[PDB]
Design an enzyme around this catalytic site. Structure first.
Site, PDB file in Angstrom:
ATOM      1  N   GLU A  35      73.342  31.988  23.666  1.00 20.24           N
ATOM      2  CA  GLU A  35      73.258  33.292  23.016  1.00 20.24           C
ATOM      3  C   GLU A  35      74.332  34.241  23.538  1.00 20.24           C
ATOM      4  O   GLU A  35      74.964  34.953  22.750  1.00 20.24           O
ATOM      5  CB  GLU A  35      71.867  33.893  23.222  1.00 20.24           C
ATOM      6  CG  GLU A  35      70.740  33.218  22.410  1.00 20.24           C
ATOM      7  CD  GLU A  35      70.804  33.487  20.911  1.00 20.24           C
ATOM      8  OE1 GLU A  35      71.642  34.302  20.467  1.00 20.24           O
ATOM      9  OE2 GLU A  35      70.022  32.854  20.171  1.00 20.24           O
ATOM     10  N   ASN A  59      67.399  41.687  18.777  1.00 21.61           N
ATOM     11  CA  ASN A  59      67.911  42.306  17.563  1.00 21.61           C
ATOM     12  C   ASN A  59      67.278  43.674  17.327  1.00 21.61           C
ATOM     13  O   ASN A  59      66.076  43.863  17.553  1.00 21.61           O
ATOM     14  CB  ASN A  59      67.635  41.375  16.377  1.00 21.61           C
ATOM     15  CG  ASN A  59      68.141  41.924  15.077  1.00 21.61           C
ATOM     16  OD1 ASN A  59      67.385  42.521  14.313  1.00 21.61           O
ATOM     17  ND2 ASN A  59      69.426  41.734  14.812  1.00 21.61           N
TER      18      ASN A  59
END
Ligand SMILES: [Cl-]
Ligand SMILES: [Cl-]
Ligand code: NA
Ligand code: NA
EC number: 3.2.1.17
Length: 129
Positions: A35, A59
């Protein structure tokens, strides 16, 4: 901060992630590698206008507030900038809420595509834990 592999494993273990909701420590280290490349300052913008923040690329549409994602929720009740700190506490606490929401670690696309079904214990091999 850019973590080392074993350094991050030790920090995640101290914050209670080893076997959290049944996911061994290697899963969390593998997800962070793909990530963010272990960089707490990583950000990436999504097509829908939201942005992903920090070592676990959380997010802004659902989990944090960055002041520029209209109609978003702030389910971890934190500014997204807090997710970029060298102290991973806020990222870990929010990740615990995410992984408990029903879909497990499949919420992280890179985990699903690059860690799931692989030998994830290799990510902690050799570390003093
Ligand atoms: Cl593991
Ligand atoms: Cl992917
Ligand atoms: Na290290
Ligand atoms: Na938001």
């Amino acid at each position: 901060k850019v973590f080392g592999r074993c350094e991050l494993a030790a920090a995640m273990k101290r914050h209670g992630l080893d076997n959290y909701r049944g996911y061994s420590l290697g899963n969390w280290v593998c997800a962070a590698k793909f990530e963010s490349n272990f960089n707490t300052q990583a950000t990436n913008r999504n097509t829908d206008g939201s942005t992903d923040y920090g070592i676990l690329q959380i997010n802004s549409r659902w989990w944090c507030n960055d002041g520029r994602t209209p109609g978003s929720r702030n389910l971890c009740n934190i500014p997204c900038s807090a997710l970029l700190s060298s102290d991973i506490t806020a990222s870990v606490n929010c990740a615990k809420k995410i992984v408990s929401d029903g879909n497990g670690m499949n919420a992280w696309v890179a985990w699903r595509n690059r860690c799931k079904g692989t030998d994830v214990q290799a990510w902690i091999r050799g570390c003093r834990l």
